Amino acid sequence: KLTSKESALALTNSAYLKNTVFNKMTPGWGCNTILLLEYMTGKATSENSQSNYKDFQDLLVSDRSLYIEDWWQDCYAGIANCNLALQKLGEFENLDASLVNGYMAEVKFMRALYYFYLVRIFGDVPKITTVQSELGELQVSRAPVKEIYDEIIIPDLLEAEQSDLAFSDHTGRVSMGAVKALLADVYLTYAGYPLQGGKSYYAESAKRSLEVIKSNEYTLFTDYESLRLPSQNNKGEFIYQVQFSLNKRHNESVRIFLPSRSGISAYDLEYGSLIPTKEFVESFEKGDKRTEEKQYFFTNYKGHPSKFSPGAAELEFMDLNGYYIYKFFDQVAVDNTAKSDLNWSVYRYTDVLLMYAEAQVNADGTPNQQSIDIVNQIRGRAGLAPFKQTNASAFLEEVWDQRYFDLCYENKMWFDMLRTRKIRDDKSGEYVDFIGYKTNWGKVYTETQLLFPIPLSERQANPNLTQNQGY
């Protein structure tokens, strides 16, 4: 005795459940799915021995490494939710078609989203759009990346794009802005590596990001504190986010960035699992607002009163003796409650603007005024003078620069590195080839590091899954 709308809404909502994969705690101390996408950039380390940063630092990542199981299983659980949701939504006859059309658009968006993470992380993956009971053989095989894009990701998004979905939503639901942001990213990536689909894919990308700009439904934040203010959840720049709230899931990842066993917080322990490198921090332009104390980074704080005896010096001031990420410092959570209700972004407007500039310059071979203005707005917020253009290549590298500098530690950089096969060198500021890059610790990237391994557990369950080269 659910009404038709309640039943349809529940099916639609089931598609959101495995959004936990984009930021959730995993087995280990201070282990979280977000670490997989930060540990290979060479711009983060760990003070936490249990995070398995070592495998990543040593270039000894294997089918037994952390995170990869969580990413595979939860993305595929999400996809199973979506496939069943879409089958059942199609069987509603009496309920308003417009309402059902919207709901199915949300689910198709989600299926595309899960698969887009899967293909970027693991490469070829099983191509599953049917409910499990209607599959012919459950020992599936990995299908080519190109097929996942052409048969699942792109058609899902193109159909969602032609639906009745609202353009924006401030409560956390999928919106047309989310569809356009994802589809911009899909086409931009399709044009890059591995697929190298053709320049027209840059133009298809630029169309979508431009639609988001022209909508006037999103605005740039004027400062950086908004990225760590719970009151800004689902508003301002934010297009799609993982939802954290006091009455649902708390954002435990806040503790990941805090200096290990330091006592600066209300949490029982700070993890210190994601620490920026000194070399990355020192690579920002001189006078950048982002490197000012307690903008993106911090170097001192005070000991929390629950952690030190009254009159301890630590209560007045503590030098942390290094750079730490302050970008996500939910101050109420850290100082008082130990229950962060700060959302984690999947897409925000700054990313979409830089995706427009990148696609546009790649399609047209020369920046237009909109792209020039985007780079200067992002630079202006950082207290930097406007960018003096010299050529299309220098402009593309400046867009890349602002992606590194503005979007750092937001799970974007690793994906940028894979689609360009370029890594920004901290010392010289030059974009060097991924294959041949030497890290701070003497290790050299090869073709192997372009993908993560298929988890050993999945391969032992299903020996029809091949493995990525080198693993």
Ligand SMILES: [Cl-]
């Ligand atoms: Cl089933």
